[PDB]
Amino acid sequence: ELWRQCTHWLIQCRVLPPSHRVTWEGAQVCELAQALRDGVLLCQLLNNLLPHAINLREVNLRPQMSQFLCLKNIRTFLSTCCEKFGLKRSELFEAFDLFDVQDFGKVIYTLSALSWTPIAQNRGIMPFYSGLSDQIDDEDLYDCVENEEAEGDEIYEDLMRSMTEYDKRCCCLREIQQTEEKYTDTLGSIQQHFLKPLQRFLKPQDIEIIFINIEDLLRVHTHFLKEMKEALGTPGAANLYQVFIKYKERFLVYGRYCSQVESASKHLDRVAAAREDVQMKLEECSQRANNGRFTLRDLLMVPMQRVLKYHLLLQELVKHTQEAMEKENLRLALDAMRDLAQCVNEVKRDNETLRQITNFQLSIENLDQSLAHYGRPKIDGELKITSVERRSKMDRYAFLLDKALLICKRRGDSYDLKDFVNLHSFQVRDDDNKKWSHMFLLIEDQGYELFFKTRELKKKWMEQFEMAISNIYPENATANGHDFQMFSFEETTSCKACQMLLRGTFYQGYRCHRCRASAHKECLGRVPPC
Ligand SMILES: [Zn+2]
Ligand SMILES: [Zn+2]
């Protein structure tokens, strides 16, 4: 069979893990299409053939809760698929031929075409339905995809590159001191050769973005390193677990950094095209500072990576510290540097969420409010509604967010907002497998029925509606006289119950407008009375 040929080829292209369900005796065609319908493997495929065909910031790496994000991946695929691979528009399928399996036959043709490209074969790899929509009705899946932080992870490992179980431990203690010395003077190189020299050329609105950050990082580490060095020089080196813990809250600036970086850096890149006197000098600063091995972009990615490495270094120092009192202490600093890394990962996720939201906002016409105010996307896709003014099933597109349902009519790539629904006032009420009969009710208890193609779709939406509503009105929200509501804190915040940090940059938790308290959703009832 020809889809079996595709499979094999996709495996040869390192796109499909050779242990995946379309590999097993019995594998249906539908299992292949299931694995391609979010355009992710397809996007990776192109990159495995033409390195850098598609920049990852253009790929929606985990789009399964979103028809919108899957479609954008497939369009990115098809589009670079003709613009960078030769293929003619009569040789590449149309999005829904894939995402709604309206003609998977033509998707397989496109790949075969790809396999015969002067590029596929230029690489050693040999070239090569109706009932689909029904059959259809994944940690494994993305094993072969570049995860989002690999680009930076190599810049970092390049920059840092250089028995018994005491030589093993000491070997680790030297990795910690050396990478730190090297990290610390790297920040210094960025200031001295970049941020200072550049200050003059650029408005304090073009550079002011990066400098306050880098400079604060240089000061913290410059000091960090002094105290790291001392605790190491002293016999044994047991004061070390204390340096890490002492500096944890100081290191929370990495949140602000790993939050503003990606934008001042895209801004730097815009002032690239928009000037010659600039583009020409960030080759100088480069050439001068390190002799052209690293651009300023390259270096701005380094702090995001460095902060994520501390728990890893300590994790290994801990494997080789046999002493009982030693271990339980290093595991304290390890606890602190792992939390640090978890906070930064929270900032990375909210960064991404905000990109998706901006994405929806640019494709939604007749929308007069900022989507960010309505919490985070839960799921978006095609359903059928009737309200109390219609009865004939109206086909509509919906975006669900924590605080709102956007009912819309899709017009190609643009979505017209026909009915914003403020979910503060609504509640979910449930009610033979006939395709499109699976409905539950969305009712205000002082005032729509939603139909889903399949039982599983309905379950997946109803589940999201419940999480959304639970976020609006969590348990104990009104407990002890409080009035807790979702809230995006601007400044680093801790909870008035678990005393630990609210994580992220965007709807980190809840706030009682009355006592000013802040809490995690779970910590809510443990919060001292209003
Ligand atoms: Zn808390
Ligand atoms: Zn209160």
**487 Cα to the center of ligand 2, angstroms:** 14
How many H helices and E strands in the chain? Answer: 19, 13
Q: How far is the CA of 509 from the centre of ligand 1 (A)?
A: 8
Alpha-carbon distance of 308 to 343, in angstroms, equals 10
Are both 339 and 419 inside the same structural domain? no
Instruction: Assign residue 332 the CATH number of its domain.
Output: 1.20.900.10
Q: Ligand 2 mean position to 247 CA, how many Å? A: 32
Q: In CATH, what number is assigned to the domain containing residue 2?
A: 1.10.418.10
Which residues, by Cβ under 5 Å, contact ligand 2, an ion? 482, 512, 514-515, 517, 530
Kindly identify the ligand whose nearest atom is closest to the C-alpha of 510.
1
CA of 484 to the centre of ligand 1 (A): 13
Ligand 1 centre from 448 Cα, in Å? 36
65 and 2 housed in the same domain: yes
Whether 213 and 158 map to the same domain: the answer is: yes
The CATH number of whichever domain residue 373 belongs to comes to: 2.30.29.30
Regarding whether 23 and 105 lie in a shared domain, the answer is yes
- Same-domain check for residues 314 and 326: yes
DSSP notation for 94-116? -HHHHHT-S-HHHHHHHHHHHHH
477 C-alpha vs ligand 1 centroid, how far in Å? 13
If one counts every other C-beta atom within 10 angstroms of the C-beta of residue 360, the result is 19
What distances in angstroms separate CA 509 from CA 17, 46, 375, 377, 519, one per listed residue? Answer: 38, 40, 11, 16, 6
What CA–CA distance (Å, rounded) separates 385 from 407? 9
Q: How was this structure determined?
A: X-ray
Question: Is the domain of 471 the same as that of 497?
Answer: no
C-alpha 160/C-alpha 306 separation (Å) is 10
Which has the closest alpha carbon to 238: 157, 326, 337, 315? 326
Nearest to 59 by CA among 352, 259, 270: 352
Which bound ligand lies closest to the C-alpha atom of 478? 2
Same domain, 333 and 398: no
CB atoms within 10 A of CB 232: 16
What is the DSSP track for 119-182? TTGGGTPPP--TTHHHHH--TTGGGGSPPTTHHHHHHHHHHH----TTHHHHHHHHHHHHHHHH
Cβ 294 vs Cβ 325: under 8 Å: no
List of E strands, 358-480: 364-365, 377-386, 394-401, 404-411, 414-422, 426-430, 438-444, 449-452
Q: Compute the distance from residue 445 Cα to the ligand 2 centre, in Å.
A: 26
What domain range includes position 189?
147-366
Strand pairing category for 364-365 and 414-422:
parallel
Is there a single domain that holds both residue 358 and residue 209? Answer: yes
Last residue within a domain, chosen from 87, 111, 146: 146
Backbone φ, ψ for residue 302 (5° rounding): -65, -50
Chain breaks in the chain (C to N over 2.5 A) after: 128, 137, 162, 431, 447
Domain termination site, one of 113, 146, 179: 146
How far is the CA of 162 from the CAs of 170, 174, 178, 182, in angstroms?
16, 11, 9, 11
Find the 516 Cα to ligand 2 centroid distance in Å: 7
Q: Ligand 2 centre and the CA of 508: distance in Å?
A: 18
Domain count, the chain: 4
- 430 and 340 in one domain? no
Cα 527 to middle of ligand 2, angstroms: 8
* C-alpha to C-alpha distance for 403 and 425, rounded to whole angstroms: 10
Answer for the pair 144, 41: CB distance below 8 angstroms, yes or no. Answer: yes
Whether residue 497 is found in the same domain as residue 420 = no
Query: Which ligand minimizes its atom distance to the CA of 512?
Result: 2
Distance from the alpha carbon of residue 494 to the mean position of ligand 2, in angstroms? 15
The Cα 346–Cα 340 span in angstroms is 10
DSSP codes, 27-59: --HHHHHHHHSSTHHHHHHHHHHSTTSS-GGGS
CATH number, domain containing residue 504: 3.30.60.20
Residue 259 Cα to ligand 1 middle (Å): 22
Q: What are all long-range contacts of 110-118, with beta carbons under 8 Å and residues at least 24 apart? A: 110/78, 110/81, 111/6, 111/9, 111/10, 111/45, 112/2, 112/5, 112/6, 113/87, 114/45, 114/49, 114/81, 114/85, 114/87, 115/9, 117/49, 117/85, 117/86, 117/87, 118/86
**354 and 384 housed in the same domain:** no
| Residues 303, 209 share a domain | yes
- Domain boundary among the residues 309, 338, 366 is at 366
Q: What would the two tokens of residue 45 be?
A: 């495929």
